[PDB]
Amino acid sequence: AEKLGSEIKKIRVTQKQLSSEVSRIESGAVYPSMDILQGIAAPIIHFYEVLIYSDIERKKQFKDQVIMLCKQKRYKEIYNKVWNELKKEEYHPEFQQFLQWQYYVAAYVLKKVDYEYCILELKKLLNQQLTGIDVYQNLYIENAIANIYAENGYLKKGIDLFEQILKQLEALHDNEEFDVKVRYNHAKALYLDSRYEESLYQVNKAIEISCRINSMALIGQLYYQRGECLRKLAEIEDAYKKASFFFDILEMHAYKEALVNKIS
Amino acid sequence: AEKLGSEIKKIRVTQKQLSSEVSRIESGAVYPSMDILQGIAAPIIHFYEVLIYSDIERKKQFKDQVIMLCKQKRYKEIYNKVWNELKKEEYHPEFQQFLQWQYYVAAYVLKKVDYEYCILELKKLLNQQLTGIDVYQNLYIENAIANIYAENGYLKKGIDLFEQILKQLEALHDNEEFDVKVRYNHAKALYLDSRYEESLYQVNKAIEISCRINSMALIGQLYYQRGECLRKEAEIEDAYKKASFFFDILEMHAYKEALVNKIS
C-alpha cells in the first residue's frame, strides 16, 4: 500500500522535475492517478508488480501466522485474529474465503457452531468461487468438511468426499504434504468404520509419499495406524517399533503415552 | 500473456460494450492499450493481478522443474533447459539471476568452467541486484559460492561465508529447510578442516530444526555426521543406529553401502 513510491524514491538514483503533488507518492498518502502513473520512467507492469509482491508478503505472513497457532491449538486466538482482520473492510475473494474458512472451523472447534451449521457455512464458500491464486485452497475446505464427519459418524459420506480428492490429486501433483494429511484422514475413518482392508492401502500410499517428499509430519501417526491396521486381520512388531522411534525424536510425548498400553 | 482477456471473456456473464479491435484481447494477440484498459468493468489492479499470478504459476513450474533434475543429478538437461529459456529474450532481473545462477553452477558441475571462474560469474549476480520477490535467492547463491570451496580446500574462507549466513537467518526465519542445507554444509567442512568441536554443535542445531520442521531431507546424512563427529561408544552407537534406519526407508542404498565398512 505504501510500496508504490518506496522503490521510486530510491530508483531516482530530479524529484522537482518529472513532467508538487508528486512528493506525496513517495510517502503513500494517496494511490497514483491513471495518467500520472504513466509519466514515471518516461516498466508499466513493474510499478504494479511490487504492489502484488508487498501484498502476498503480508498475506503469506498471516497465512503462515494461522499455521503456528493451529499446531499450538490456540483456536480462540485464531478466532480473534481471523475476526479482527475480517473486521477491516477489504475486498479479496481468495483471502476472505480463507479467513472465513478458518473462522467457521475455529467456531466449530470452540463449539460456538453446530457440526451441520459449519458444513453449510463452509459449503457456500466452496460452491461459489472464482479462485485464480491458490487452487488447493478449495481442496483444504473439502478435507475440512470431510474430516468433520468423523466425530459425527457420517463417515460413509465422509469417505465419498475423501475419494473425490484422489481424482483432483492427479491434476498437477504439486503439493504432496496435503496428500499425507488427506490419505491419513481417509485411513483414520476407514479403520473407524472397521474396514481394515483399504485402511492399510491408504496408509502405505501416504508412507510411500512421506519417504519421497521427506516429510515426517504424519509418519509417526502413519506407522501407528499401520501397526494397528495389521493388529486385526512379525510384521506387526516391525511397524510398532518404527512408529515408537519417531514419537520421542519429534518431541511428541502425549501420543507416546498411549504406546506402552498397546504393545504389551 | 494470454490470461488478459481469458477471464474477461467469462466475466461477461455486455458483448457489444465498446463505449472491433476489442475481440483480439480474448485471443491475446496484442497487449491492451493504456486508455482502453480503463474502459473495462465500467478492479484496475485485478486485470494486472492475473498477469502476475499467470506469470508466477509458470515461473514456479520452471523453478520446481529444475529441483527434480537437481536431485536426479541430470545437470546437462538443467544446463540445456536453463539455456533455451535464457535464449528467449525476456526481461526479469529476479528470474534471470536464478537462471544464470543455475547455468554457472551446472557448467561448473559439468566441468565446463573453473572453480574460480564460477565464483567470479556468481559474485557479480550477488553484488549487483534489486530483489523484490525471493529474498532468500541471494542466500542460496552465497551457499553455492561457499559450498564450492570444499573440493577446493579454501574452507577457511568457506566457513566465513557460512557464518555470514547465520547473521541473515535471524532476520525473519521463513525457510527452515534451507538452514538444514547450510548448517549441514557448514558442519561437513568443519569435520574436513578436522575441527570436531563445533562440527557437532552445527549438526545438532540442524537436527533440532529437522525435528521441528518435520523434514528428514538431510536427517540421514546429519546423524551419519553425528556418529562420525562422536567417533573422534554408547553415544556413538546411538547416533550410528539412528542414521542407518533412515537410509533404507528413504530408499538411499548408495549412502547405505558405506555404513557396514564404518561400524565393524
XYZ file of C-alpha atoms in Angstrom:
528
model
C 0.000 0.000 0.000
C 2.984 2.319 0.751
C 5.415 0.359 -1.517
C 4.199 2.333 -4.637
C 6.601 5.305 -4.287
C 9.006 3.455 -1.899
C 11.365 1.986 -4.554
C 10.531 5.064 -6.763
C 12.281 7.349 -4.169
C 15.387 5.068 -4.497
C 15.061 4.364 -8.300
C 15.682 8.168 -8.768
C 19.477 7.472 -8.447
C 15.344 15.164 -10.171
C 12.340 14.939 -7.740
C 11.444 18.603 -8.595
C 11.391 17.800 -12.366
C 9.115 14.904 -13.509
C 6.810 16.461 -16.221
C 4.340 19.467 -6.167
C 1.753 16.643 -5.611
C 4.452 14.099 -6.780
C 6.136 14.218 -3.317
C 3.040 12.524 -1.696
C 3.557 9.332 -3.816
C 6.943 8.514 -2.130
C 5.150 8.559 1.308
C 1.965 6.625 0.390
C -0.803 9.116 1.305
C -2.929 8.628 -1.869
C -2.665 5.986 -4.673
C -1.324 7.419 -8.011
C -3.733 8.576 -10.796
C -4.300 6.762 -14.159
C -2.395 9.343 -16.279
C 0.212 10.355 -13.603
C 1.382 6.670 -13.182
C 2.308 6.501 -16.927
C 4.621 9.552 -16.548
C 7.104 7.590 -14.367
C 10.221 6.014 -16.126
C 9.176 8.014 -19.245
C 8.065 -0.979 -16.773
C 4.256 -0.184 -16.583
C 3.793 -3.704 -15.074
C 6.707 -3.287 -12.542
C 5.031 -0.352 -10.696
C 2.068 -2.780 -10.179
C 4.276 -5.916 -9.711
C 5.674 -4.561 -6.397
C 2.101 -3.898 -5.111
C 1.266 -7.635 -5.507
C 4.629 -8.765 -4.020
C 4.099 -6.439 -0.981
C 0.507 -7.764 -0.708
C 1.434 -11.509 -0.998
C 4.314 -10.909 1.518
C 1.933 -9.734 4.336
C -0.846 -12.155 3.168
C 1.579 -15.147 3.444
C 2.798 -13.720 6.799
C -0.844 -14.051 8.032
C -1.343 -17.426 6.255
C 1.859 -18.698 7.988
C 0.664 -16.991 11.260
C -2.562 -19.077 11.451
C -0.414 -22.276 10.936
C 1.660 -21.773 14.153
C -1.480 -21.226 16.281
C -3.257 -24.270 14.655
C -0.370 -26.553 15.803
C -0.304 -24.715 19.197
C -4.100 -25.476 19.241
C -4.764 -21.835 20.331
C -8.125 -21.675 18.475
C -9.600 -18.636 20.347
C -6.501 -16.605 19.330
C -7.066 -17.804 15.692
C -10.817 -16.912 16.022
C -9.902 -13.398 17.309
C -7.035 -12.748 14.789
C -9.254 -14.021 11.933
C -12.162 -11.759 13.114
C -10.088 -8.537 13.625
C -8.547 -8.956 10.115
C -12.059 -9.709 8.686
C -13.409 -6.618 10.615
C -11.119 -4.463 8.384
C -13.205 -3.774 5.260
C -11.038 -5.263 2.489
C -12.097 -6.809 -0.849
C -10.357 -10.068 -1.924
C -12.473 -13.167 -2.843
C -9.473 -15.527 -2.325
C -8.238 -14.114 1.041
C -11.764 -13.625 2.504
C -12.667 -17.297 1.689
C -9.585 -18.479 3.689
C -10.291 -16.068 6.608
C -13.973 -17.119 6.830
C -12.975 -20.849 6.371
C -10.660 -20.546 9.407
C -13.432 -18.586 11.245
C -16.197 -21.225 10.771
C -13.905 -24.185 11.650
C -12.450 -22.281 14.707
C -16.036 -21.541 15.901
C -16.867 -25.253 15.322
C -13.722 -26.221 17.328
C -14.538 -23.665 20.117
C -18.039 -25.360 19.978
C -19.639 -21.979 19.015
C -21.404 -23.509 15.965
C -23.039 -26.914 15.153
C -21.348 -29.631 13.024
C -24.086 -29.124 10.358
C -24.201 -25.282 10.635
C -20.413 -25.342 9.990
C -20.883 -27.735 6.958
C -23.453 -25.288 5.466
C -21.337 -22.131 6.093
C -18.315 -23.970 4.581
C -20.259 -25.406 1.570
C -21.275 -21.891 0.377
C -17.611 -20.720 0.050
C -16.835 -23.921 -1.883
C -19.784 -23.952 -4.378
C -19.455 -20.180 -5.131
C -15.838 -19.233 -6.049
C -13.616 -17.578 -8.744
C -10.145 -18.575 -7.340
C -7.203 -17.807 -9.634
C -4.402 -17.700 -6.984
C -4.345 -20.980 -4.977
C -6.485 -23.793 -6.485
C -5.595 -26.017 -3.462
C -7.478 -23.567 -1.074
C -10.841 -25.123 -2.067
C -9.363 -28.646 -1.618
C -8.420 -27.906 2.041
C -12.070 -26.778 2.606
C -13.352 -30.167 1.271
C -10.974 -32.009 3.666
C -12.236 -29.566 6.399
C -15.833 -30.659 5.549
C -14.950 -34.399 5.093
C -12.793 -34.731 8.260
C -15.648 -33.220 10.361
C -17.891 -36.278 9.717
C -15.544 -38.474 11.879
C -16.633 -37.423 15.442
C -20.149 -37.322 13.863
C -20.427 -40.824 12.327
C -21.434 -39.863 8.753
C -18.033 -41.322 7.624
C -19.777 -43.250 4.766
C -20.414 -39.812 3.129
C -17.055 -38.645 4.535
C -15.097 -41.296 2.542
C -17.034 -40.253 -0.645
C -15.570 -36.711 -0.305
C -12.078 -38.135 0.552
C -12.179 -40.360 -2.617
C -13.346 -37.205 -4.518
C -9.960 -35.595 -3.560
C -7.970 -38.571 -5.120
C -9.390 -37.641 -8.600
C -8.216 -33.986 -8.070
C -4.769 -35.231 -6.874
C -3.732 -36.449 -10.384
C -4.429 -32.935 -11.816
C -0.888 -31.484 -11.184
C 0.586 -33.208 -8.080
C 2.309 -30.021 -6.814
C 1.654 -30.251 -3.045
C 2.310 -33.750 -1.617
C 2.309 -32.588 2.048
C -1.502 -32.179 1.718
C -1.878 -35.724 0.253
C -0.337 -37.072 3.505
C -2.958 -35.035 5.528
C -5.904 -36.355 3.386
C -4.676 -40.008 2.985
C -4.073 -40.159 6.779
C -7.587 -38.729 7.479
C -9.048 -41.176 4.877
C -7.279 -44.169 6.545
C -8.252 -42.822 10.042
C -12.019 -43.148 9.184
C -11.692 -46.466 7.247
C -10.349 -48.044 10.485
C -13.279 -46.350 12.406
C -15.867 -47.873 10.000
C -13.891 -51.133 10.790
C -12.812 -51.665 7.126
C -9.236 -52.954 7.830
C -8.717 -53.736 4.062
C -8.054 -50.408 2.233
C -7.154 -48.632 5.527
C -3.710 -50.306 5.122
C -3.589 -49.388 1.371
C -4.234 -45.688 2.241
C -1.528 -45.733 4.982
C 1.070 -47.485 2.725
C 0.277 -44.918 -0.049
C 0.916 -41.935 2.317
C 4.056 -43.656 3.828
C 5.265 -44.006 0.170
C 4.733 -40.202 -0.346
C 6.283 -39.177 3.057
C 9.533 -41.029 2.148
C 9.739 -39.356 -1.321
C 8.751 -35.834 -0.150
C 10.972 -36.159 3.011
C 8.222 -35.095 5.475
C 7.930 -36.979 8.788
C 4.892 -34.735 9.691
C 2.303 -37.571 9.895
C 4.865 -40.506 9.689
C 4.669 -41.281 13.439
C 0.847 -41.294 13.331
C 1.063 -43.130 9.931
C 3.116 -46.124 11.253
C 0.934 -46.210 14.454
C -2.094 -46.809 12.171
C -0.102 -49.438 10.162
C 0.709 -51.296 13.428
C -2.984 -51.051 14.482
C -4.325 -51.969 10.980
C -2.009 -55.048 10.956
C -3.143 -55.789 14.595
C -6.534 -57.007 13.261
C -6.622 -59.284 10.129
C 6.422 -60.218 12.948
C 5.121 -57.537 10.505
C 3.029 -56.032 13.371
C 6.159 -55.648 15.647
C 8.014 -54.113 12.601
C 5.533 -51.197 12.153
C 5.077 -50.908 16.003
C 8.820 -50.312 16.718
C 9.073 -47.979 13.636
C 6.364 -45.568 14.955
C 7.556 -45.511 18.661
C 11.016 -44.323 17.416
C 9.602 -41.108 15.808
C 7.336 -40.078 18.742
C 10.321 -39.206 21.010
C 12.628 -37.627 18.336
C 9.754 -35.415 17.116
C 9.168 -34.459 20.837
C 5.602 -35.905 20.887
C 5.111 -37.348 24.425
C 1.259 -37.038 24.501
C 0.922 -39.636 21.676
C 3.892 -41.628 23.213
C 1.863 -42.214 26.468
C -0.746 -44.422 24.651
C 2.004 -46.667 23.163
C 3.011 -48.911 26.152
C -0.749 -49.561 26.839
C -0.933 -51.037 23.248
C 2.268 -53.177 22.888
C 2.147 -55.453 25.996
C 0.451 -13.358 -21.509
C -2.894 -14.664 -22.922
C -4.669 -14.561 -19.494
C -5.590 -10.820 -20.027
C -8.855 -11.356 -21.958
C -9.229 -15.008 -20.787
C -11.278 -14.355 -17.594
C -12.698 -11.199 -19.346
C -14.476 -13.482 -21.923
C -16.066 -15.349 -18.929
C -16.573 -12.241 -16.654
C -19.048 -11.006 -19.385
C -21.582 -13.437 -17.755
C -22.345 -6.868 -22.480
C -20.947 -8.408 -25.729
C -21.049 -5.111 -27.724
C -19.837 -2.817 -24.906
C -17.204 -0.646 -26.661
C -18.087 2.824 -25.197
C -13.884 -4.095 -33.482
C -10.253 -4.427 -32.207
C -11.669 -5.443 -28.737
C -12.128 -9.108 -29.787
C -8.338 -9.900 -30.150
C -7.891 -9.302 -26.348
C -9.702 -12.676 -25.818
C -7.040 -14.397 -28.011
C -4.148 -12.260 -26.678
C -2.569 -11.169 -30.000
C -1.653 -7.687 -28.649
C -1.479 -6.367 -25.027
C -4.274 -3.818 -24.189
C -3.630 -0.028 -24.520
C -3.420 2.403 -21.526
C -6.749 4.228 -22.162
C -8.575 1.058 -23.414
C -7.663 -0.739 -20.089
C -9.727 1.868 -18.123
C -12.909 1.113 -20.142
C -13.226 -2.404 -18.610
C -15.680 -3.451 -15.756
C -17.249 0.036 -16.307
C -10.736 -3.613 -10.303
C -7.896 -1.742 -12.202
C -5.405 -3.846 -10.144
C -7.267 -7.183 -10.824
C -6.708 -7.032 -14.636
C -2.951 -6.799 -13.764
C -3.168 -9.184 -10.736
C -3.991 -12.172 -13.009
C -0.959 -11.353 -15.247
C 1.387 -11.776 -12.225
C -0.432 -14.935 -10.985
C -0.202 -16.489 -14.514
C 3.488 -15.439 -14.632
C 4.406 -16.780 -11.121
C 2.473 -20.032 -11.949
C 4.728 -20.883 -14.983
C 7.832 -19.352 -13.263
C 7.319 -21.642 -10.194
C 6.631 -24.549 -12.615
C 10.173 -23.946 -14.022
C 11.654 -23.288 -10.534
C 10.115 -26.626 -9.363
C 11.278 -28.228 -12.697
C 14.995 -27.504 -12.025
C 14.575 -29.081 -8.498
C 13.573 -32.560 -9.841
C 16.547 -32.662 -12.255
C 18.978 -31.429 -9.496
C 18.001 -34.443 -7.300
C 18.079 -36.706 -10.429
C 21.606 -35.196 -10.953
C 20.713 -34.641 -14.667
C 22.921 -31.493 -14.924
C 23.260 -31.396 -18.769
C 19.431 -31.386 -19.032
C 19.390 -28.486 -16.463
C 22.179 -26.716 -18.475
C 20.142 -27.117 -21.720
C 16.706 -26.189 -20.194
C 18.297 -23.181 -18.427
C 19.995 -22.080 -21.726
C 16.911 -22.482 -24.017
C 14.781 -20.451 -21.530
C 17.619 -17.840 -21.261
C 17.862 -17.833 -25.136
C 14.274 -16.416 -25.171
C 14.751 -12.641 -24.864
C 12.829 -11.842 -21.662
C 13.460 -9.061 -19.108
C 13.223 -10.006 -15.382
C 16.168 -9.204 -13.016
C 14.992 -11.795 -10.419
C 14.258 -14.706 -12.832
C 17.390 -14.097 -14.992
C 19.639 -14.131 -11.847
C 18.233 -17.598 -10.896
C 18.546 -18.933 -14.496
C 22.164 -17.705 -14.837
C 22.962 -18.946 -11.238
C 21.804 -22.452 -12.253
C 23.723 -22.057 -15.582
C 27.127 -21.175 -13.999
C 26.883 -23.903 -11.298
C 25.683 -26.524 -13.899
C 28.661 -25.594 -16.156
C 30.932 -25.871 -13.061
C 29.382 -29.309 -12.284
C 29.671 -30.437 -15.978
C 33.337 -29.198 -15.567
C 32.779 -26.602 -18.368
C 34.062 -23.725 -16.169
C 36.789 -23.330 -13.460
C 36.048 -23.210 -9.690
C 37.292 -19.560 -9.654
C 35.646 -18.549 -12.987
C 32.341 -19.819 -11.487
C 32.972 -17.833 -8.201
C 33.508 -14.630 -10.277
C 30.440 -15.172 -12.543
C 28.361 -15.904 -9.390
C 29.779 -12.943 -7.351
C 28.592 -10.397 -9.985
C 24.927 -11.538 -9.612
C 25.276 -11.259 -5.808
C 26.948 -7.778 -5.628
C 24.587 -6.218 -8.266
C 20.830 -6.811 -7.575
C 17.385 -5.248 -6.704
C 15.346 -8.231 -5.313
C 11.639 -7.748 -4.525
C 10.271 -11.356 -4.609
C 12.602 -14.104 -3.200
C 14.841 -12.518 -0.524
C 16.375 -15.959 0.175
C 17.555 -16.264 -3.526
C 20.795 -14.330 -2.888
C 21.391 -16.519 0.213
C 21.277 -19.694 -1.976
C 23.975 -18.114 -4.239
C 26.176 -17.384 -1.147
C 25.825 -21.065 -0.084
C 26.512 -22.058 -3.771
C 29.755 -19.969 -3.615
C 30.659 -21.166 -0.045
C 29.974 -24.907 -0.637
C 32.249 -24.822 -3.748
C 35.366 -24.171 -1.587
C 35.110 -27.746 -0.117
C 36.580 -29.840 -3.024
C 38.968 -26.836 -3.397
C 40.404 -26.519 0.145
C 39.715 -22.799 0.769
C 37.251 -23.937 3.526
C 38.754 -21.338 5.971
C 37.169 -18.625 3.729
C 34.250 -21.020 3.101
C 33.287 -21.114 6.826
C 33.451 -17.247 6.914
C 30.665 -17.124 4.264
C 28.695 -19.918 6.070
C 28.889 -17.938 9.393
C 27.796 -14.845 7.350
C 24.513 -16.731 6.571
C 23.806 -17.312 10.373
C 23.509 -13.485 10.858
C 20.955 -13.344 7.947
C 18.999 -16.331 9.402
C 17.732 -14.301 12.443
C 16.220 -11.680 10.051
C 12.765 -13.393 9.676
C 13.135 -17.208 9.901
C 10.818 -18.136 6.990
C 12.569 -21.094 5.288
C 13.973 -23.578 7.835
C 14.577 -26.221 5.091
C 17.444 -24.025 3.768
C 19.006 -23.736 7.280
C 19.330 -27.565 7.289
C 21.140 -27.367 3.851
C 23.574 -24.619 5.087
C 24.165 -25.997 8.662
C 24.860 -29.463 7.150
C 27.307 -27.943 4.584
C 28.905 -25.860 7.411
C 29.347 -28.999 9.608
C 30.561 -31.009 6.531
C 33.582 -28.623 6.087
C 34.299 -28.204 9.856
C 34.899 -32.001 10.005
C 37.107 -31.672 6.817
C 39.247 -28.926 8.462
C 39.381 -31.521 11.362
C 37.642 -29.174 13.882
C 35.494 -31.847 15.665
C 34.303 -29.220 18.265
C 31.631 -27.006 16.590
C 31.039 -29.607 13.816
C 28.882 -31.405 16.469
C 27.153 -28.100 17.505
C 26.211 -27.338 13.830
C 24.870 -30.907 13.206
C 22.743 -30.909 16.430
C 21.488 -27.368 15.603
C 20.171 -28.638 12.202
C 18.913 -31.949 13.794
C 16.921 -29.697 16.242
C 15.403 -27.803 13.224
C 14.721 -31.011 11.158
C 12.670 -32.373 14.125
C 10.648 -29.106 14.495
C 10.126 -28.516 10.733
C 9.405 -32.279 10.142
C 11.890 -32.653 7.232
C 14.024 -35.822 7.092
C 15.753 -34.421 3.915
C 19.299 -34.247 5.400
C 18.498 -36.209 8.674
C 20.144 -39.453 7.452
C 23.287 -37.557 6.389
C 23.058 -35.448 9.608
C 23.064 -38.430 12.045
C 25.870 -40.059 9.938
C 27.980 -36.925 10.629
C 26.963 -37.026 14.356
C 28.144 -40.677 14.565
C 31.410 -39.716 12.766
C 31.903 -36.476 14.806
C 31.428 -38.506 18.046
C 33.809 -41.194 16.580
C 36.804 -38.863 17.206
C 30.975 -45.911 22.251
C 27.462 -45.757 23.858
C 26.547 -42.290 22.433
C 28.432 -43.195 19.196
C 26.331 -46.434 18.713
C 23.159 -44.321 19.455
C 23.712 -41.878 16.524
C 25.103 -44.752 14.309
C 21.922 -46.923 14.582
C 19.701 -43.774 14.205
C 21.208 -42.842 10.777
C 21.297 -46.443 9.308
C 17.490 -46.675 9.944
C 16.675 -43.683 7.638
C 18.957 -44.719 4.715
C 16.741 -47.725 3.788
C 13.284 -46.116 4.433
C 14.275 -43.067 2.345
C 15.424 -45.569 -0.398
C 19.081 -44.380 -0.278
C 21.226 -47.517 -0.917
C 24.310 -45.674 -2.340
C 24.956 -43.978 1.060
C 23.876 -47.267 2.852
C 26.804 -49.190 1.192
C 29.452 -47.152 3.130
C 27.791 -47.924 6.539
C 28.935 -51.553 7.215
C 32.561 -50.537 6.310
C 32.336 -47.936 9.191
C 30.571 -49.807 12.079
C 32.656 -53.027 12.452
